[PDB]
Structures are given as structure tokens and as C-alpha cells.
Design a binder for this molecule. Structure first.
Ligand SMILES: Nc1ncnc2c1ncn2[C@@H]1O[C@H](COP(=O)(O)CP(=O)(O)OP(=O)(O)O)[C@@H](O)[C@H]1O
Ligand SMILES: Nc1ncnc2c1ncn2[C@@H]1O[C@H](COP(=O)(O)CP(=O)(O)OP(=O)(O)O)[C@@H](O)[C@H]1O
Ligand SMILES: CCC[C@@H]1C[C@@H](C(=O)N[C@@H]([C@H]2O[C@H](SC)[C@H](O)[C@@H](O)[C@H]2O)[C@H](C)Cl)N(C)C1
Ligand SMILES: CCC[C@@H]1C[C@@H](C(=O)N[C@@H]([C@H]2O[C@H](SC)[C@H](O)[C@@H](O)[C@H]2O)[C@H](C)Cl)N(C)C1
Ligand SMILES: [Mg+2]
Ligand SMILES: [Mg+2]
Ligand SMILES: [Mg+2]
Ligand SMILES: [Mg+2]
Ligand SMILES: [Mg+2]
Lengths: 266, 266
């Protein structure tokens, strides 16, 4: 894989460069899920007093020639290399390595070994041993209530804009509804490790039954298709709620979902 | 309108309640766009001493009985009243009233008069006057570049996950692409006030030609429809880039977009 050649380059350069004190890899190549379709991604920890003006544009070209480079909404440098591999490099002071513990909340981190690329001081390895084995419990009453409330809110907003004739906006809301629904399916089927990344591995991780029901909640930009998708979204959540009620005390009841259902033809 | 009755109750209670110093309304009922499909929304500014313990659930019930209340991801109290009207209420200390001037970054502020629901001290009116008539100018090289780079980033990521067979994830990414594409159309057509709310009034605000093109970038959860939508997504952005390049210096060139296009079948 071209990706692995680039990863090796990153390891090489982060070790040899005096400006870089640590490098943490994350993503699929640290979880046995890397393939030819994957990107590569790192936190690059820099000498504190040279962090502001660090020439990351030049450093990234030293990794490999690139076609495009910009800073995304998360402050991460994103590169499209000339071989079309995407790379995400988050550059920050070594003094901000204390961000790492909060990563335990992002998902299941069974192993940390592939994450350790370079570690000048030993501090990176120490932070990683704090998150190694991290596994958020997603199967909570709190989560079930938030998702059902969040869905009801978004569904009602969506059906309203649809009734107005704001079709494109109802489609946008439907995609937000869909993310929430995936999280509900993962709750109902007790396979919720891929939580924030709810669509990762979906074809491998959920029942055909609910996959097909989810597919029915999708639509192109079309009034009739949107109405069908919105209706099927509600029906699916009604199924999920009647399953989840057995496990949690829910504030969104079948009655409340029934009122939303009736509203479609109002 | 049920909405107007509820706004009236909010006006009534915010005035009379000694714990509430000011109430600012926003959204479509302050922008000449309110209708039967609208929600209602307010910032409620509380006397500083009681902000910490204020029982919002109790107060919102006084506005009208509700079927559902929860805090969304923005910390907004979101309510579905028992007549199925949606309400969004942001409770803050009076001392945070100075967040108001930053609202000018969100878009055009046509009517600060309709925004003033209650103002004990005259303070709210003063902050609102600072934003009246204001709008960002979205027509910039910085915006053209970010959107084209962000689109290219998300598109290449999305086509990779589609090729992988992660269809549900490619759909999720497609919806993110779609929002970037609406902002790009708004730049090209120079109708960019509805920027963060890019799909608001979309059917009324962009040309029939670009609406039709945008509609072809949409898909249901289906391999063939997804490949069609991803191609049409890039082709639309290629059209838009050819216009934008005349106005701004752009990092994303036609040649780069063509590399991405050829990548679909590689
Ligand atoms: N919404 C989210 N919030 C927080 N962390 C997330 C997240 N989505 C993904 N992540 C984390 O960031 C890592 C990198 O994510 P991405 O590169 O977007 C997908 P990936 O799992 O690396 O697969 P891929 O790049 O091979 O397609 C993921 O493995 C996950 O640990
Ligand atoms: N993404 C965003 N970021 C920041 N502000 C936004 C935003 N989207 C919308 N807004 C602002 O928040 C106001 C209320 O938004 P919404 O209630 O979601 C839509 P609306 O314009 O009120 O129409 P509607 O409620 O009648 O359908 C908008 O009018 C706009 O001023
Ligand atoms: C052990 C996981 C480390 C991850 C590092 C950190 C992070 O930088 N995530 C990014 C996150 O952003 C998107 S997915 C929304 C990218 O596709 C992904 O590769 C990653 O860079 C955002 C801030 Cl969520 N995440 C919170 C967890
Ligand atoms: C005069 C506009 C005032 C608005 C008030 C403030 C706000 O609370 N916006 C909300 C925003 O959130 C979503 S749309 C993302 C809601 O649909 C919308 O009614 C509004 O409540 C988020 C924090 Cl962006 N926005 C930054 C601007
Ligand atoms: Mg990755
Ligand atoms: Mg990534
Ligand atoms: Mg509104
Ligand atoms: Mg609203
Ligand atoms: Mg009461």
C-alpha cells in the first residue's frame, strides 16, 4: 500500500527532525482496518517555542509531493498527495499533549501499540497507556433518551420544512435524522463501539433486517421520495423505541411517536 | 397562528417574571419568513444571582404544556409543546448579553425591532442596534478556497469509502458535500446571505439550472445511485469552479478536479 510507504516516511522524518518531539498515529491503520481506500492521520507534537511558525507546508511536501493543502474546521492540516492519498496532520505544541486522555471518549481503543510512532520524552507512551483499553459504555438510559428526543426534534422540524416546500432543507435534516437512527440501531442491537463513527463498517456490523429498514429512510431530492423516507424514518424509530423501552426508562413514548405519525397528513 | 399565541405568552411571562431581565427573539418571525410550519425561538437573559439554579422546565411549562424537553448539542433547551409547535430557548445570565454583537457573523439581520421581546434596562435594545442591518460579505477568496478545498477533501474521502463498499458512510459524506455545494452555488450566483443556513429558501434563491444539477447529486442508499451522485457532485463543482476562477485566485484548479474525476474508475 502507498499509505504504508507514506506512514514509514512520517516515522522516518518525525524521528530525525529536531522540531518534532512526538508523533501519534490514529485511525484505521492503528485498528487493523486500513486498506487501499484509507487515509493516513497523525498528531505531530512540536517543540513548544517554534510551534506558531512551524513550516508545515514544506514539511508535508517532504513527506511526499502534494496537490492540495488546507486547514480544516478542526484546525487539522489536510493534504491530498499527488498519488491521491489523503493525509490529516494535526500540528500542536508538545505542551498540548494533555489532549490525549480526552481521546478515550471517542471510541473503543483496544490497542495503543500502532499509535506510538515517535516519542522523545516518553510522555506520549505514558498518555497512550492511560487510554489503552478505553471503551465508552454507550448502552445507557441517557443515550437512549437523547437520541429519541434528538430524533423527534429533528423529524418534526424536517416534516414541517417538507410540508412548506423547502425540499432541499428537508433532505439536509433527513441526513441528520439518519445519523441518529444509526446510533439507535447500534443501541438496539448492542453493537455500539462505532458510535461517533456510526456508519463505519455498517454493512458488516448490523442486521440485514435493520439495514434494509434504514435504506428505506433514504431519499433523493424529490417530494414523494422525501415523504416516504420521513414516514419510514418514523416507523423505524417506533420499532426501535418499542425494543429500547424493555431496557430503559424512556421520556419519548410510543404515544408521542404516534402523534408525530398522525401529523404527516395534517 | 399557534406560534403567535406562544410568542405572546413568552412576551407576557418574560416581562412579568422578576428573574428575567431581557428576552430576544430570533429566526423567521424576526425576518418576515414566519409561517404555520415555523418554530419559535428566544434567548432568555436571567438576573445573575439566580441563573445557576433556574428551573427552565417549570418556566417553559408556564409558557404552555409540553410533551418533550431536552438540551441539544448546542446546550439549547428544545421543547415540543403539546400542540406540536417546536420551541428553542437559550437561557443565559444577563451578564452574557454581550454575546449579541457576535450574532452578526451568522448572517443578515433585517429587523432588530421584532427581535426585542422584553428589555428591563434598555441594554438589549442597545446591543441589537449594533447589529441592525448588518450582514457578512461571503464573497471572498478565503470562502471560495475553503469550500473548494473542503469539498475536494470530503469528495475524495467519500469516493474511497464508496469504492470500499461502505455505502452508508458514503451517503453520510455525500450529505456533507451537498452543504458545501450549496454554499459554492451561492458564491457563484452571488446570493449568499443564507450561508450557514444554506438550504433555507433554496427553491426560491438559486437558479433552476443549478437546482436541477444539485438534485442530481442526491442518492438513496444504493451503489449505482451513489456513484451517479458522486460523479454529478464533482461535475457540478467543476462547473462552479470555472466561474469562481474568474473572481478569485484558487488553490483548487480544473486539473486537480479532473484528477479526482478520473479517480472514480481507478
Ligand atoms: N465523529 C468522530 N468523532 C471523534 N472521533 C472520530 C469520529 N469519527 C472518526 N473518529 C476517529 O478518527 C479515526 C480516523 O477517522 P477517519 O479517517 O475519518 C475513518 P478511519 O476509521 O480511519 O477509516 P478509513 O480512513 O480507512 O476510511 C477513526 O478511526 C476514529 O478513531
Ligand atoms: N447553522 C446556523 N448557524 C448559526 N445560525 C443559524 C444557523 N442556521 C440558522 N441560523 C439562524 O437561526 C435562525 C433560526 O433557525 P431555524 O429555526 O433553524 C430556521 P428559521 O429561519 O427560523 O425558519 P423556520 O423555523 O420558520 O423553518 C435562522 O433564521 C438564522 O438566523
Ligand atoms: C483515538 C482517536 C483519536 C482521535 C483524534 C481526535 C480527532 O482529531 N478527530 C477529528 C476527526 O475528524 C474527522 S471525523 C469527524 C476525520 O475524518 C477524522 O480522521 C478525525 O481527524 C475531529 C476533531 Cl472529530 N478525535 C477526537 C479522536
Ligand atoms: C440573529 C441570529 C441569532 C442566532 C442565535 C445563535 C444560535 O443559538 N444558533 C443556534 C442554531 O442552531 C440550530 S441551526 C444550527 C437551530 O436550528 C437554530 O434555530 C439555532 O438555534 C446554534 C448555536 Cl448555531 N446563532 C449563532 C445566531
Ligand atoms: Mg482514516
Ligand atoms: Mg481521516
Ligand atoms: Mg425558526
Ligand atoms: Mg429553530
Ligand atoms: Mg408552573
Amino acid at each position: 500500500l502507498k499509505q504504508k510507504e507514506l506512514i514509514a516516511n512520517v516515522k522516518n522524518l518525525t524521528e530525525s527532525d529536531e522540531r518534532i518531539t512526538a508523533c501519534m498515529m490514529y485511525g484505521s491503520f492503528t485498528k487493523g482496518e486500513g486498506d487501499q481506500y484509507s487515509d493516513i492521520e497523525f498528531y505531530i507534537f512540536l517543540k513548544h517555542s517554534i510551534t506558531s511558525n512551524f513550516d508545515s507546508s514544506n514539511w508535508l511536501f517532504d513527506v511526499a509531493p502534494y496537490l492540495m493543502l488546507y486547514k480544516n474546521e478542526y484546525g487539522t492540516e489536510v493534504v491530498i498527495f499527488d498519488n491521491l492519498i489523503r493525509g490529516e496532520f494535526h500540528f500542536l505544541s508538545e505542551k498540548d499533549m494533555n489532549i490525549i486522555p480526552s481521546f478515550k471518549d471517542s471510541g473503543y481503543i483496544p490497542d495503543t501499540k500502532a499509535m506510538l510512532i515517535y516519542d522523545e520524552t516518553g510522555q506520549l507512551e505514558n498518555y497512550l497507556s492511560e487510554i489503552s483499553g478505553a471503551r465508552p459504555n454507550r448502552l445507557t438510559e441517557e443515550n437512549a433518551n437523547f437520541l429519541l428526543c434528538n430524533f423527534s426534534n429533528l423529524w418534526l422540524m424536517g416534516i414541517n420544512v417538507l410540508k412548506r416546500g423547502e425540499y432541499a432543507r428537508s433532505l439536509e435534516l433527513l441526513s441528520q435524522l439518519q445519523k441518529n437512527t444509526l446510533q439507535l440501531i447500534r443501541m438496539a442491537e448492542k453493537n455500539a463501539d462505532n458510535w461517533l463513527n456510526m456508519s463505519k463498517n455498517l454493512e458488516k456490523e448490523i442486521s440485514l433486517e435493520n439495514y434494509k429498514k434504514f435504506a428505506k429512510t433514504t431519499a433523493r431530492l424529490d417530494k414523494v421520495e422525501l415523504f416516504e423516507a420521513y414516514k419510514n424514518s418514523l416507523l423505524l424509530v417506533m420499532d426501535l423505541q418499542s425494543h429500547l423501552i424493555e431496557q430503559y426508562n424512556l421520556k419519548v413514548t410510543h404515544d408521542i411517536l404516534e402523534r408525530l405519525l398522525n401529523y404527516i397528513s395534517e
